[PDB]
């Protein structure tokens, strides 16, 4: 609920449209939102059904000049961006400013790779879909419709995960030392009083 300066949303496991609606309402209200790992988003419905939906989307182009028509972006970040822009009054100055408040990425590039990523429970697939239902991963659909950088993104993601695991090992080592020191300095007058206060 708090007004954060930037909210970085880890897009893994999130349903496309529900996340899009929440993020649209957020950025219309003046909140800066950065969605990372847009290749890990999810769409309800089997893979083939969503591929057919995208092919129906591709069928639409300006007859007299194909360069004027809708521009079908294949990248997962751009698919999420299309979903969000559909939910924004983008043809006004206010909508344009609201769209300037949003960033979408595949993977977690710098500088967000060392920041805090949060999730949105109201849009999480594992919390929303009935457990037997089928779903699509937006990265696979993007590869199926012409996105060219799935292998590069997964390589960079595995490298980033190796780095992040090393960081986490260091952090977990450091916090364990602090917990040991806090336990030693317990049962003192400062510690005993802080227990009576609920701390």
């Amino acid at each position: 609920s708090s007004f954060e300066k930037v909210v970085v949303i880890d897009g893994k496991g999130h349903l496309l449209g529900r996340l899009a609606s929440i993020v649209s309402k957020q950025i219309l209200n003046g909140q800066k939102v950065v969605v990372v790992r847009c290749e890990e988003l999810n769409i309800s419905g089997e893979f083939f059904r969503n591929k057919l939906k995208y092919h129906d989307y591709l069928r639409k182009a300006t007859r007299y000049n194909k360069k004027k028509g809708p521009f079908h972006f294949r990248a997962p970040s751009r698919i999420l961006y299309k979903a969000i822009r559909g939910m924004i009054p983008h043809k006004t100055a206010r909508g344009k400013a609201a769209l300037e408040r949003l960033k979408v990425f595949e993977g977690v590039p710098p500088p967000y790779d060392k920041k805090k990523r949060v999730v949105v429970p109201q849009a999480l697939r594992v919390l929303r879909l009935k457990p037997g239902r089928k779903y699509t991963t937006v990265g696979k659909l993007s590869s199926a419709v012409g996105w060219k950088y799935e292998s590069v993104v997964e390589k960079l993601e595995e490298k980033r995960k190796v780095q992040s695991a090393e960081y986490y090992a260091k952090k977990k080592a450091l916090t364990k030392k602090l917990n040991a020191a806090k336990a030693s300095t317990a049962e003192s007058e400062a510690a005993q009083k802080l227990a009576a206060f609920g701390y």
């Binding site: 007859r63 007299y64 000049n65 595949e106 590039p109 950088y149 590069v152 993104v153 390589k155 960079l156």
Partner: protein, 291 residues
Amino acid sequence: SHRKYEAPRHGSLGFLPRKRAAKQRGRVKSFPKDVKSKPVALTAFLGYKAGMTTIVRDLDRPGSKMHKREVVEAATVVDTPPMVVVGVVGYVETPRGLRSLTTVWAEHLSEEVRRRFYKNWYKSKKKAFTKYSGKYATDAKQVETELARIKKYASVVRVLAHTQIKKTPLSQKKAHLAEIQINGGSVSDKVDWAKEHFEKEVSVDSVFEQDEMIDVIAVTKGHGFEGVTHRWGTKKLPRKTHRGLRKVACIGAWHPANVNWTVARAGQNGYHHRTSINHKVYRVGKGTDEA
């Protein structure tokens, strides 16, 4: 209503827009896929179309009526003086495509390639690459640092090579400088090969063999503004047509109330960038040969 009679359309939609090439030098859109097992070798070369000639050859094609019989064939000559390696570029894989990371130049550049960086050479102080050449001050550690960066981070290594146009009969003094992808070996091997070849000449004999199939990248012959009859090969109208006959009679139906992009219009003809494939190398001749 439908056409009374069916016919294929005139011209290809796969070569639009029929506009002038942005540069007179053809650029290699795609390079052969890199195989690490192969030895480190170049993938492209630059030459000059000299002209066409005629050869005679015994055809070796079993089952053909011309098998073991002479055939007269047209051939094209490409004057290819050796190219000089002057630089190396490293390219890094990104989610947004290949991105050049680092360019390392040779210590010394010939004047004909330094002219490439000038629109008015005769009025210049000719300051190009002077501070960069000074960067080789008795240790060249900045160059080694950049080369180490290319080795560590780059995934595609290309070499900057220029032609020795002074060896050709052309009056142009600017050399042509181009990026040629290096295939084979690891990135370290490619960078070592590029460094060991700075300021050296590379001949066509080390790039192309005889009897190879190669592709040609070039800008075609220009013709200027051209009408639909020659630009697209449409049918001329009858002799008795008012206001002329080298036209397309119907440029569209009433709806869409626009002119479609697929209708033939007059415009610029020729001088297009074209890639032609599967040309057999009949001969690799040497300039030192007197026969």
